[PDB]
């Protein structure tokens, strides 16, 4: 109980320090920025072939190959340019909540309620996709999954921890600690030196994969965090909550920077992604349509209406040439 | 023409499309059952062409993923679960030891299995009629 007083004496000190740098707000600093204007995008391609809800999706670094996982227990590697199917990987358990496509394109990972992250080998002999490894060690639903360039995978499970594995050996080499709830979101850095995880505590922490220390910790949300993504330069990130309030934080300022709220939506947010230049902040709400926000004005710039169910996944290619979304209607659509 | 190898690639895509449909038929001819009250445990048993797939399970975040299951089984709070915007349109089966069904367990295994099989049928009937423009 003695340490409780010290913790209170520390949290208030941190709160006061953050307020010291609070000299203005982005909504007032960039009032002279010309609005981007109405942005209209048409569904160029409509990939179909899934027979259940689509829970995850990831873009290959080449910006052409697209993976997707659904409740059918089948990953599909799409060719976005021609809508062709490159692979169809069957899964041992049809409970998948995430997927990742390796930066080099050799491997693809997935996982879910089985508490197992399976690494599949795409480019191999005999033209057959087989489970290269079966990572185990978590104690809860595997929430998110991302590949580091060195073929070492970072996972975030429902046991309130995030681990860094070694595909070659198959055992954890690091472990987040500090979250007080299920970790639902995870986002690497462009340089892969840092990453952030959002949990069911209205808190988003920052981690270092090199030595394993919690650098910052951002609060301000009122409910769980269901998605996170970095600004292209890697000095800021945006998170999506269940109270329909996307918030943009800054790493160097250690304080919330801007908020994107619209009372017309009362349902939560299920995906957040930035554009190549970082001016656009796409968001996938549960109202069955996306909302292409403005990263600097908090004013809507369009909507990607055209989904019959909620938008559960949302990703933007590396070159920014397209946007893909996958709703529970079992349909992926490439916008632009 | 406009395609040289893409014709071969398109042929491969059409072969994958078929495999999804053929295996997609098996999923349609199946009923998923969730039991409430490491990993996930699954129990598969056939019953007159119904390959019943009965599987058993912060804690409120696991309900979005299980939505769509045919029914929920209780073996023994129930009011709150029924009005969570997820299982509102899902039947609940309760064993003693949205059309809520209650049955007293019996020593014979066939009788218990018979009751649950019937409970799945009618809920399937209701879905069919609702999808047939009748109710």
């Amino acid at each position, epitope marked *: 109980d003695q340490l409780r007083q010290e913790a209170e004496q520390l949290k208030n000190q941190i709160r006061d320090a953050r307020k010291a740098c609070a000299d203005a707000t982005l909504s007032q600093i960039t009032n002279n920025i010309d609005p981007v204007g109405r942005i209209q995008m048409r569904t160029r391609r409509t990939l179909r072939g899934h027979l259940a809800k689509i829970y995850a999706m990831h873009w290959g670094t080449d910006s*052409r190959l697209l993976v997707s996982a659904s409740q059918d227990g089948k990953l599909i590697i799409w060719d976005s340019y021609t809508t062709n199917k490159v692979h169809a990987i069957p899964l041992r358990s049809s409970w998948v909540m995430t997927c990742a496509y390796a930066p080099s394109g050799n491997y693809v990972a997935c996982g879910g309620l089985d508490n197992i992250c399976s690494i599949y080998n795409l480019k191999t*002999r005999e033209g057959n996709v087989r489970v290269s490894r079966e990572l185990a060690g978590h104690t809860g639903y595997l929430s998110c999954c991302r590949f580091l360039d060195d073929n070492q995978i970072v996972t975030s499970s429902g046991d309130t921890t995030c681990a860094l594995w070694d595909i070659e050996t198959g055992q954890q080499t690091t472990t987040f600690t500090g979250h007080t709830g299920d970790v639902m979101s995870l986002s690497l850095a462009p340089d892969t030196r840092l990453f952030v995880s959002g949990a069911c505590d209205a808190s988003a922490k920052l981690w270092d994969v090199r030595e394993g220390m919690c650098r910052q910790t951002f609060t301000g949300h009122e409910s769980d965090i269901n998605a996170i993504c970095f600004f292209p330069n890697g000095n800021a990130f945006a998170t999506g909550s269940d109270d329909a309030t996307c918030r943009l934080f800054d790493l160097r300022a250690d304080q919330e920077l801007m908020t994107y709220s619209h009372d017309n939506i009362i349902c939560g947010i299920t995906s957040v992604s930035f554009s190549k230049s970082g001016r656009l902040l796409l968001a996938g709400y549960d109202d069955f349509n996306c909302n292409v926000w403005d990263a600097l004005k908090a004013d809507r710039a369009g909507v990607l209406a055209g989904h019959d169910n909620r938008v559960s996944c949302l990703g933007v290619t590396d070159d920014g040439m397209a946007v893909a979304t996958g709703s529970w209607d079992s349909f992926l659509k490439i916008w632009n | 023409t406009l395609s*040289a*190898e893409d014709k071969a*690639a398109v*042929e491969r895509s059409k072969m994958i499309d078929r495999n999804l449909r053929e295996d997609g038929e098996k999923a349609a001819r199946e009923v998923k059952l969730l039991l409430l009250g490491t990993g996930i445990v699954e129990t598969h048993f056939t019953f007159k062409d119904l390959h019943f797939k009965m599987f058993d399970v912060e804690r409120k975040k696991w309900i979005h993923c299980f939505e769509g299951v045919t029914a929920i089984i209780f073996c023994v709070l129930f009011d709150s679960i029924c009005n969570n915007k997820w299982f509102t349109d899902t039947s609940i089966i309760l064993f003693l030891n949205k059309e809520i069904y209650t049955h007293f367990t019996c020593a014979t295994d066939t009788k218990n299995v018979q009751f649950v099989f019937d409970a799945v049928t009618d809920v399937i009937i209701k879905n069919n009629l609702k999808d047939c423009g009748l109710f």
Partner: single-chain antibody
């Protein structure tokens, strides 16, 4: 992974013969299959092709009608029913696999070969070169020419470079512009555009001696080059 075929031997001209290839170590049902003959002293020549799942079949003009190709996935066997043999049908027959999807490497693995002996216009590719004497350690460049432009509207230049070491089936080196095959040293490099193509070898080693063939996959029938050869 082996692709071994059996059959061959002397056959009365005008008769029929059956050539079978047994595939083990890889998923046969998911691969396309090609037949390529090689006359004793002329070079490689395309024969026939059967897609994955017997979707489509293509035959060379010189052997259209009297040749049939069949595929039996459950037993992993490829059959070439040969009918009305003639003097020029004699050749060393190879069985080649090729999987077609975005980013794949078709013609990667070649069979071993069965020797078949018979007792007594649209796309042309030329290699204006012959046996080039070369010593180890010096770079070598091999030229190639195409009647048509192999570049396509989608940006893929369908040229494949094969190497046939003495006494062994040809091995894939490069399948497109600078697209090295698996298990090939970095020394080899590919380049060129349009109808002009070149293959460069850096720090040539002893094992690199052989015959280099150029093939186009832009449109059937597939046609090989003159097979430039290297002398140590």
């Amino acid at each position: 992974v082996q692709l071994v075929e059996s059959g061959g031997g002397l056959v009365q001209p005008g008769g029929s013969r059956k050539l079978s290839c047994s595939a083990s170590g890889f998923a046969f049902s998911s691969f396309g299959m090609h037949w390529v003959r090689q006359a004793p002293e002329k070079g490689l020549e395309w024969v026939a092709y059967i897609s994955s799942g017997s979707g489509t079949i293509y035959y060379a003009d010189t052997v259209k009608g009297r040749f049939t190709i069949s595929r039996d996935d459950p037993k992993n066997t490829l059959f070439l029913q040969m009918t009305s043999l003639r003097s020029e049908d004699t050749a060393m027959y190879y069985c080649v696999r090729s999987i077609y999807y975005y980013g794949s490497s078709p013609f990667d693995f070649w069979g071993q070969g069965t020797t078949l002996t018979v007792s007594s216009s649209d796309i042309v590719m030329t290699q204006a070169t012959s046996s080039v004497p070369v010593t180890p350690g010096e770079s070598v460049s091999i030229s190639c020419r195409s009647s048509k432009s192999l570049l396509h509207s989608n940006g893929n230049t369908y040229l494949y470079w094969f190497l046939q070491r003495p006494g062994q089936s040809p091995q894939l080196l490069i399948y497109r512009m600078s697209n090295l095959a698996s298990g090939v040293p970095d020394r080899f490099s590919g380049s060129g555009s349009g109808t002009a193509f070149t293959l460069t070898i850096s720090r040539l080693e002893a094992e690199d001696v052989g015959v280099y063939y150029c093939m186009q996959h832009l449109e059937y029938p597939l046609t090989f080059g003159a097979g430039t050869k290297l002398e140590l």
